[PDB]
């Protein structure tokens, strides 16, 4: 099937807890993949206004690793759900992706999850200012614009642009290109 086809493409690609007790300011990040239409879709967070860092931002949904996390998929999890809803039995984690460096001192894991097709996201308004689907074919021939390269995607049902940049671009790229390549229509 589609989605069994997904996962055992991800699975190629699951660095496990290789990096997991290295010494670092620890963030885990959630890729949540949403079947609709037939099709994969990722979904993603617009940041709120009132947030410190990055305001108004295209992200996925994680956060800061907290004492309480069994692991770090436990806190890209327990993330999720305190800002869009997300609770774990609507959410299977099928692998950890490449870390991602930054600023000499933090370590940020990402994580692919599968979400249950009878989700629906509740946007917690004090993080999470909006959730929107992106087909994950889009990022194979995406809308690239100059500012380094920000891609633009505007969704079909309202007609309204987001901006998709940096690490949050090259994710969903690396996802797109894992699951898609090769692919008989
Ligand atoms: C920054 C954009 C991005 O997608 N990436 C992946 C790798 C780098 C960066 C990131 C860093 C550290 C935490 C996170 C995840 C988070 O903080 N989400 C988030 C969303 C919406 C409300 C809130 Cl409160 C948080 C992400």
Redesign the pocket.
């Given at each position: 099937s589609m989605l069994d086809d997904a996962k055992a493409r991800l699975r190629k690609y699951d660095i496990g807890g290789k990096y997991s007790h290295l010494p670092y300011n620890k963030?885990s990040?959630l890729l949540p993949l949403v079947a609709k239409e037939g099709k994969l879709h990722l979904l993603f967070?617009?940041?709120?206004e009132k947030?410190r860092?990055?305001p108004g931002?295209?992200?996925?949904?994680?956060?800061?690793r907290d004492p309480t996390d069994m692991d770090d998929a436990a806190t890209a999890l327990r993330?999720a759900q305190?800002?869009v809803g997300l609770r774990p039995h609507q959410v299977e984690v099928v692998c950890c992706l490449v870390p991602?460096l930054?600023d000499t001192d933090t370590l940020?894991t990402?994580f692919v999850g599968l979400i249950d097709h009878n989700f629906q996201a509740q946007p917690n308004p004090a993080?999470?200012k909006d959730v929107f689907l992106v087909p994950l074919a889009y990022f194979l021939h995406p809308q690239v614009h100059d500012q380094n390269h920000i891609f633009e995607y505007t969704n079909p049902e309202d007609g309204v642009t987001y901006q998709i940049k940096?690490?949050?671009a090259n994710?969903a790229v690396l996802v797109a290109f894992i699951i898609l390549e090769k692919k008989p229509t």
């Open positions: 963030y990040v967070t617009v940041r709120s947030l860092r990055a931002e295209v992200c996925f949904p994680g956060g800061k993330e305190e800002e991602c930054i940020i990402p993080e999470v940096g690490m949050t994710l």
